[PDB]
Amino acid sequence: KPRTVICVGDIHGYISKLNNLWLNLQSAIDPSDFSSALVIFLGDYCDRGPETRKVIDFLISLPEKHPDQTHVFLAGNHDFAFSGFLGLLPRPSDGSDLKDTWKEYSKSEETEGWYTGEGFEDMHLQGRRWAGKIKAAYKGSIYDAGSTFESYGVPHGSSDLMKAVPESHKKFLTNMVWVHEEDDVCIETEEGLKHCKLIAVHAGLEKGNNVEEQLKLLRAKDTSISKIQHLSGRKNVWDIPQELDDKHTVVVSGHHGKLHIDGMRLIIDEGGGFPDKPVAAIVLPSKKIIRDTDNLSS
């Protein structure tokens, strides 16, 4: 029997949506298949929603709760930005300073009110944007990070967040990956069951540039990049790029604020960080969509 693969869209601090989805998934999938499933969280665990802390608590608990599952946690643009503010990103491997990332977006500083509190000098651009105060509705910053601060019991933009975030959560953020690759997953098509490669990346992959070169920087976590298009892009990462456009690779992403299935391109982000929208997961091989808003039993 083919292994069950669950790909979970953006959570954005909605603990109730995360819990209800997890509970629904256990009625849609039989106990044996669920217990040994590959579970790929597609990123964006923080911001917008009110309970980031509880979300990360939940995700940390999963290895203990389900020892035979494989758990993959993609870094979203939001979580990369979160990790940046906490100073958890490794120094750029090219020897540059994290402050060098600011220059490209320097004209955005005034409107975005970038963090100028303690430790801003050694901070990645996205960390400074994340903890900024946007001139006005946004929750504190352009990243809607206000609710993340509050979920850990501190005001928005506070340097004290660094002390409030538990060590296990910092370890969780350090353990996130920018890409996940699988050699062999099953997926239903109109013609029948297929075996495919899988690439999981929060937003997607770029056109033009060699795919392996892209995957290389993603595997290595290059912090010299001001804005990581693979985590933050929109139209530029929507499509499967030329090199992978041959029906042998599933490319799964969250990020886009839409649930969109087009052949081998899976975009799983029905929630979009909105409080009134469902969080959806896709279950492979069947491609069935399970939501927090479901009321399932077996």
Kindly list the catalytic residues. Answer: 78
- Binding Zn ion (rule: CB under 5 A), the pick from 6, 7, 8, 10 is 10
Is 24 one of the binding residues for Zn ion (CB under 5 A)? no
- 215 near 249, Cβ under 8 Å? no
57 carries a ligand binding annotation: no
277 carries a ligand binding annotation: no
Range 46-105, binding Zn ion (CB under 5 A): 76-77
Distance from C-alpha of 18 to C-alpha of 77, rounded to nearest angstrom: 19
Quick note: the x/- pattern for Zn ion over 226-255, rule CB under 5 A, is: -----------------------------x
- 288 near 188, Cβ under 8 Å? no
H/E stretch holding 147: helix 146-151
Q: Which of residues 28 and 251 has its CB atom nearest to Zn ion in the complex? A: 251
Is 277 one of the binding residues for Zn ion (CB under 5 A)? no
- Binding Zn ion (rule: CB under 5 A), the pick from 4, 21, 29, 44 is 44
Tally the C-alpha atoms within 13 A of residue 218's C-alpha that lie toward its C-beta.
26
Minimum distance from residue 258 beta carbon to Zn ion (Å): 11
Q: Which of residues 28 and 75 has its CB atom nearest to Zn ion in the complex? A: 75
Q: Which amino acid is at 180?
A: H
**What are the two backbone dihedrals, phi and then psi, of residue 145, each rounded to the nearest 5 degrees?**
-75, -15
Q: Which of residues 34 and 80 has its CB atom nearest to Zn ion in the complex? A: 80
* Residue/partner pairs of 211-216 with CB below 8 Å, 24 or more apart: 211/241, 211/243, 211/244, 215/179, 215/181
Write out the residues near Zn ion by the rule CB under 5 A.
10, 44, 76-77, 255
